[PDB]
């Protein structure tokens, strides 16, 4: 699951530095904001959404941005 | 003169196989995404596949995944793209086109702003 | 999937010369402003009109225009001249693959 986030969250950030993909986390289908800086800092944006399916987000956001920088 | 120049289509039978040829002139081709964008005699486009600058990303349209294989040589500024189990839907007008999208960049550009005149497969036994 | 659909319409226009034009794109979901719009002349590569939903791109002539965000878009010419008869095609580039509408060819009224 978190990596099939990565997945899509890659296939978004390929022609444009600013998209919005649909997540399926658990059980709702949560739109999810993606944004990228010309430094290369990734910000994973998910509105109306539960603390719970914010932190599943917040991890994905922070293993991709270890991905990265290295 | 920024330009892509395409080279090796032509008449194939089915199930054989097909290598397309780009070459790229008047700009940095190692700062650019490519893609192949196909164009069926009469109807719309189709993107078929594209290469990141680094070959980091490969992505592949499914109704010729597995089949084509895509593959860049930024030493000789040019792109390629192998075809094989070719079918008769595989008939077209191929395009090589640049991505304007360039990542780390300090102003950005999308779409697809370079495109090549195009090199014929035809697919007929 | 995650494969976003685009749809042209009209899928033909017919228009003189002077006419004020509008054409409509629309997305299976949402795409931000990540659109772009293409004409393509008879046996010609097509040529990048506009990038950003609203950004022309250098070159084209002011009487286009691009305008929408998220899964409803248009293009506008707003006086067609007689070398604006081909065929409009919109293109998504959110995230891949990268998807084309079927395009909307525009023609002589006559």
């Known amino acids: 699951t978190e990596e099939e986030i990565i997945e899509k969250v890659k296939s978004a950030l390929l022609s444009t530095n600013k998209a919005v993909i649909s997540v399926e986390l658990k059980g709702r289908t949560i739109p999810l904001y993606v944004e990228i800086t010309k430094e290369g800092k990734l910000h994973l944006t998910a509105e109306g959404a539960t603390e719970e399916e914010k932190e599943i987000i917040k991890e994905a956001q922070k293993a991709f941005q270890e991905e990265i920088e290295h | 003169e920024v330009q892509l120049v395409e080279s090796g289509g032509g008449l194939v039978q089915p199930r054989r196989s097909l290598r397309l040829s780009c070459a790229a002139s008047?700009?940095?081709?190692?700062?650019?995404?490519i893609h192949w964008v196909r164009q069926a005699p009469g109807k719309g486009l189709e993107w078929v596949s594209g290469?990141?600058?680094?070959?980091?990303?490969?992505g592949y349209a499914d109704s010729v995944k597995g089949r084509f294989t895509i593959s860049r040589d930024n030493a000789r500024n040019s792109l390629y793209l192998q075809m094989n189990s070719l079918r008769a839907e595989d008939t077209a007008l191929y395009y090589c086109?640049?991505?304007?999208?360039?990542?780390?960049?300090?102003?950005?550009?999308?779409?697809?702003?370079?495109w090549g005149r195009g090199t014929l497969v035809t697919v007929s036994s | 999937t995650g494969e976003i659909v685009m749809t042209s319409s009209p899928a033909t226009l017919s228009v003189s010369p002077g006419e004020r034009v509008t054409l409509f794109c629309r997305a299976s979901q949402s795409v931000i402003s990540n659109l772009a719009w293409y004409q393509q002349k008879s046996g010609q590569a097509p040529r990048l009109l506009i990038y950003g939903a609203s950004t022309r791109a250098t070159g084209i002539p002011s009487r286009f225009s691009g305008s929408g965000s998220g899964t409803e878009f248009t293009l506008t010419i707003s006086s067609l001249q007689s070398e604006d008869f081909a065929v409009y095609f919109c293109?998504?580039?959110?995230?891949?693959?990268?998807?084309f509408g079927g395009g909307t060819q525009v023609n002589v009224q006559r």
């Open positions: 290469i990141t600058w680094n070959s980091g990303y490969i």
């Open positions: 086109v640049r991505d304007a999208y360039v990542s780390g960049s300090d102003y950005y550009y999308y779409g697809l702003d370079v």
């Open positions: 008047g700009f940095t081709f190692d700062d650019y995404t």
């Open positions: 293109q998504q580039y959110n995230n891949w693959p990268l998807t």
